[PDB]
Write a protein that binds this DNA or RNA. Structure first.
Lengths: 308, 248, 149, 147, 49, 49, 49, 235
RNA sequence: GCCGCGAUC
């Protein structure tokens, strides 16, 4: 008995601006859907952003290159705003080389297989003499949210050679999104509601695909509601007892006392095992001696003892 | 530690340390200087008859206690006469209203009382005196960020603070710039003014990332791109917390 | 918004500079946004020059006699691209912009004169009952960092 | 705009100036001593300050007048500054008097009081002398607190 | 003095003051409702101020 | 005790601060020791004990 | 010793008896307790480990 | 990495009495707790199927303010009592039910004439305390199935005042939710520290388990998104 | 083992 919204009359204003219309809506559902979609789109949207770069002659971000008009730190900031669209891959490498006089933009990036630069006038550096050159290799990745360069550590599992520059990643193609609620033009129904979602991205995502992604994210999140219901670690320990090359006399004594594991012996303080029959003062020293060789002195205290 | 009424145009009444050293450490006002003997003066404009002239006379603390000194925020006419017959003034440490013919001296500008640190606060008059003190002291502690960002609302005194601090690189005799680098700027001086013999060009060696006393970084980034004409006193490289020669 | 402040700190500390500066910065950023949108449509040089001229001579007997008539074509575009982020106005210390001038500047940019806008909550999306004063204030980051404290 | 300026401020300032001019003429006549005129001018300025603060309070307390189901009715205003002052959250009527009403008499070079007060508030501007005069009290308070 | 030192101030006091005030005319006049539970439902739905 | 408590509270109560009288009487008690003697017989004479 | 010092901010989600303590000051104030718990559970047989 | 999200697992439910429940979900990705809580709260509060009384007819005078013929309660009071009554109807849009009692004794919901189609969940609910002594009270009620909350703005039915007097403009609370409020706290999993957990608190007027109320809100919200999730579906 | 200087609440 609830009308279902249909994504109709989608119109595009510019290469970034976009308006998506949801014609049939009920009384109060317009604001609910608009807020949910806006939060989903602003929070978690897939996108591509530059992860790390490699310039030929630089060593770190706080240096300069002869012949260029900008610092390497500045160049990283102009690169951070570069937006790309990759198809079928996630670790695309964007190598660019340029020589001469004038600004160097994304239009001169080498033409890879399937990578679309949304805007080709995005300047990243300027050249100031005829004979200087700039050769850099840019790596772009795909992500979901804001990932600072400092926070990530898994990228350091393999050592990064001196010269690899780390740049923060944003991964969010949606920069601004606002919704509006009006009255639908349907007159046969008494009063109906329509929703228009003005969305401003960097051109990396399709507005209809963005709305679809938000809707499926919301549906998968809500899937958990439609069915509520619901109404001794060290390797040195846990070892066989007959591994400490003890004497014959201690072997039978331990069996009678039932010390079948190493950790059971280490928990016995010196004042109590001496009461065991035929333990032996010199033999007791032998047990202490071999256990001191492993670094396991008598008198420790454990908490939990699994049978195995 | 009190503000004597002769601290008008020579010592700032706002900028000063707060807890222990209040009233013992001061800051010279914008237009103040020292005497040939070592006394602080303050500019004033001579007023003859009812029209204030543009001639400027420098008055020490002792001398200013005899004349009658007008107010900077007093209206004027096209020729120079005061717009009212009654004008607020300062005679000897106090303030009253005097006749237009009794006025003897005129305040040069509304920035005379304050110092450099308190001059960069917009709507200073709308702020409490102690809160203005705290803001003026806190301005001297901001760290220069990664990118300079001009103030959308300022007091026009940012340029004077940035240019005369020595942080920026000012073209001493530059003409048309010849080659701009991320660390070097070279300008070919225009022919109208040259030193005869050996010709020559002016070369600037910008200082890149360098530790400062408070462990902060000092950076200089060029402004001019290429072939841009540059006049005397023009700013080419803006230092830390400076955008196009504007303190930011 | 980028920063959210507490209104309870103004009436007791008597920092009226905060509110007037926020209103004036909002007006300046409205002018800058108008110029940026105008540059987005790449309209004719004459219209942009006329708008900049009408936004520069606004005030009340201001001692600012700048004019774009003596400005050639290419420097007008350079100026407009330099102030697209916002028109960087300057009010001198003790004699500056008045409330009427700030209101006229706000009205020039098609903004609410009173200086307050209707702000919607980001979480629940419910309109805040009273209008909230939104403006662009210049925030400094002091040298007292927790990493050192 | 939340610092509603009283509409009667300038009229009472003008009448205070007229009274001060009259007492100045009386002193010029020679029948009034310096102490008498000084105390009288302090008294009249204090009375004017009280009157302007009170008038501000009447204009700001129940400023909002909203029509009921019939005719029109007035009630306590929803002015944000007035709400902050009356709720006791932060601020007080004394601090409000320096935002819309006149700043009033203030002086402490030694402990005396200047004859001419500060007739401008923080919502409007303050010229050089009014700010410089308020600096005396501000510096004295900031030095007293630390000692 | 025996007065409770732990007492809400500033934003808490402003919120309580704004919540407990009366307007001459607003959304909902003379309405009769079951209890405090309905007051939250009417306010959160926007039908009352 | 009546004089000191009232005179001390007079300075405090004027600035609108609340201090209970017990906290002032406690200090007064520590000011009211070490009496002098105008008699003898018990190994004490004209000394402040 | 066993003492720290850092700037304080506001936490409104906290109860009346809770304070937010950074996990970097902890693990330094409670280092000996951590040693004791590590040795008790057998994760580190020796103190050096 | 991309397209995968943390789903809430091992939820907590603390049922109290038969209409009070405090559901808890953990962990939800940063920002999803507020979105889910607000969406479910708005749906449960503003648009939910249910039933509540709308019109009453008391024998005697039909004015809004009346002497109430001495039933020890004002007519406003008994109008307040009837608003909180919770009913169930099996497949009928509107139905008329009549109550009649003679003899001293407070009136309850069980004293209405029996209908096999109208189900009363709280027959011990008290409406009035009889017409003083040695008298009777006659009242007929109509209840219709609606949606959300509809205040007594106006009748705008029939002609002139025939319908307003025939209805007395009783407030209707169709949605069977007494109070819904959510709180979002912080929880952590593995190394991640900034995650959201959602705590849902709801009390019901009856006729519906709070679990069922959440389930209905969730299923209608999910079915509102079919036109977008159908083509881009995993299955 | 300090002395000066600057800074924060």
């Amino acid at each position: 008995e609830f009308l279902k919204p249909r994504l109709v009359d989608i119109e595009q204003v510019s290469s970034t601006h976009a308006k998506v219309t949801l014609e049939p809506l009920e009384r109060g559902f317009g604001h609910t859907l608009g807020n949910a979609l806006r939060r989903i789109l602003l929070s978690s949207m897939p996108g591509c952003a530059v992860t790390e770069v490699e310039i030929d002659g630089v060593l770190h971000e706080y240096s300069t290159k002869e012949g260029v008009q900008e610092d390497i730190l500045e160049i990283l900031l102009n690169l951070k705003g570069l937006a790309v669209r990759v198809q079928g891959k996630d670790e695309v490498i964007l190598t660019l080389n340029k020589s001469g006089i004038g600004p160097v933009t994304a239009a001169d990036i080498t033409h890879d297989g399937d990578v679309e630069i949304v805007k080709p006038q995005h300047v990243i550096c300027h050249l100031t003499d005829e004979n200087a050159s700039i050769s850099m290799r840019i790596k772009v990745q795909r992500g979901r949210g804001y990932v600072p360069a400092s926070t990530r550590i898994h990228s350091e599992e393999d050592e990064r050679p001196i010269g690899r520059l780390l740049v923060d990643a944003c991964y969010s193609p949606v920069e601004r999104i606002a919704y509006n609620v009006e009255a639908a033009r349907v007159e046969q129904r008494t009063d109906l509601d329509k929703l228009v979602i003005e969305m401003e991205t960097n051109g990396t995502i399709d507005p209809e695909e963005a709305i679809r992604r938000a809707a499926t994210i919301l549906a998968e999140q809500l899937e958990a509601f439609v069915d509520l219901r619901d109404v001794e670690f060290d390797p040195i320990l846990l070892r066989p007892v007959d591994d400490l090359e003890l004497t014959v006399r201690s072997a039978n004594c331990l069996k009678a006392e039932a010390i079948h594991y190493i950790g059971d012996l280490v928990q016995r303080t010196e004042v109590e095992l001496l009461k065991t029959p035929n333990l032996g003062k010199k033999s007791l020293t032998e047990i202490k001696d071999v256990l001191a060789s492993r670094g396991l002195s008598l008198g420790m205290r454990l908490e939990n003892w699994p049978p195995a | 530690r009190d503000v004597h009424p002769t601290h008008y145009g020579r010592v700032c009444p706002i900028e000063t340390p707060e807890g222990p050293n209040i009233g013992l450490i001061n800051s010279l006002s914008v237009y103040a200087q020292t005497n040939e003997y070592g006394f602080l003066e303050t500019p004033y404009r001579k007023v003859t008859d009812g029209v204030v002239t543009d001639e400027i006379h420098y008055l020490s603390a002792i001398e200013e206690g005899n004349y009658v000194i007008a107010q900077a925020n007093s209206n004027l006419d096209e020729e120079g006469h005061f717009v009212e017959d009654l004008v607020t003034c300062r005679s000897k440490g106090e303030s009253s209203l005097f006749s237009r013919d009794q006025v003897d001296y005129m305040d040069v500008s509304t920035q005379q009382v304050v110092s450099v640190g308190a001059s960069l606060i917009p709507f200073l008059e709308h702020d409490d005196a102690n809160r203005a003190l705290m803001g003026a002291n806190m301005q001297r502690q901001a760290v220069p960020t990664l990118r300079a960002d001009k103030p959308l609302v300022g007091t026009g005194m940012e340029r004077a603070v940035a240019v005369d601090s020595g942080v920026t690189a000012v073209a001493k005799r530059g003409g048309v710039v010849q080659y701009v680098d991320a660390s070097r700027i070279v300008i070919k001086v225009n022919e109208d003014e040259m030193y005869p013999g050996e010709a020559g060009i002016d070369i600037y060696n910008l200082t890149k990332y360098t530790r400062s006393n408070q462990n902060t970084c000092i950076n200089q980034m060029p402004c001019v791109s290429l072939g841009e004409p540059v006049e005397r006193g023009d700013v080419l490289a803006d230092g830390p917390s400076t955008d196009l020669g504007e303190l930011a | 918004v980028d920063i959210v402040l507490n209104p309870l700190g103004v009436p007791s500390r008597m920092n009226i500079g905060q509110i007037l500066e926020t209103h004036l910065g909002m007006a300046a950023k409205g002018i800058g946004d108008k110029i940026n949108a105008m540059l987005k449509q790449q309209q004719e040089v004459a219209k942009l020059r006329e708008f900049i001229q009408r936004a520069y001579d606004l005030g009340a007997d201001v001692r600012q006699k700048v004019d774009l008539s003596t400005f050639s074509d290419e420097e007008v575009m350079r100026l407009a691209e330099n102030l697209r982020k916002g028109m960087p106005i300057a009010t001198p210390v003790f004699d500056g912009a008045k409330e009427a001038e700030i209101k006229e500047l706000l009205k020039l940019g098609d903004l609410p004169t009173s200086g307050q806008i209707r702000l919607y909550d980001g979480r629940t999306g419910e309109q805040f009952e009273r209008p909230v004063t939104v403006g662009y204030m210049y925030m400094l980051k002091l040298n007292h960092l927790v990493d050192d404290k | 705009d939340d610092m509603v300026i009283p509409e009667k401020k300038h009229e009472i300032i003008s009448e205070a100036e007229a009274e001060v001019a009259e007492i100045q003429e009386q002193f010029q006549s020679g029948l009034v001593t310096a102490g008498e005129r000084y105390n009288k001018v302090i008294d009249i300025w204090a009375a004017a300050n009280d009157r302007v603060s009170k008038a501000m309070m009447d204009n700001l307390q129940t400023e909002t007048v909203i029509n009921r189901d019939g005719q029109e009715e007035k009630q306590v205003s929803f002015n944000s500054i007035y709400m902050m002052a009356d709720s006791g959250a932060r601020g007080s009527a004394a601090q409000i008097r320096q935002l819309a009403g006149m700043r009033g008499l203030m002086a402490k070079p030694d402990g005396s009081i200047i004859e001419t007060p500060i007739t401008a508030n923080f919502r409007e501007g303050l010229n050089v002398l009014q700010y410089f005069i308020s600096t005396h009290g501000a510096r004295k308070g900031l030095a007293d607190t630390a000692l | 003095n025996g007065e409770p030192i732990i007492v809400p101030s500033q934003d808490v006091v402003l919120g309580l003051y704004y919540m407990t005030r009366d307007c001459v005319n607003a959304k909902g006049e003379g309405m009769v409702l079951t209890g405090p539970k309905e007051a939250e439902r009417l306010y959160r739905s926007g039908l009352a101020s | 005790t009546r004089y000191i408590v009232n005179e001390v509270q007079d300075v405090y109560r004027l600035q609108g601060v609340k201090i209970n009288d017990k906290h002032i009487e406690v200090i007064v008690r520590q000011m009211l020791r070490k009496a002098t003697i105008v008699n003898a017989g018990s190994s004490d004479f004209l000394e402040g004990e | 010793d066993y003492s720290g010092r850092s700037v304080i901010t506001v936490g409104p989600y906290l109860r009346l008896h809770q304070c937010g303590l950074p996990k970097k000051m902890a693990l330094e104030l409670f280092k000996p307790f951590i040693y004791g718990k590590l040795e008790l559970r057998g994760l580190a047989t020796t103190i050096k480990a």
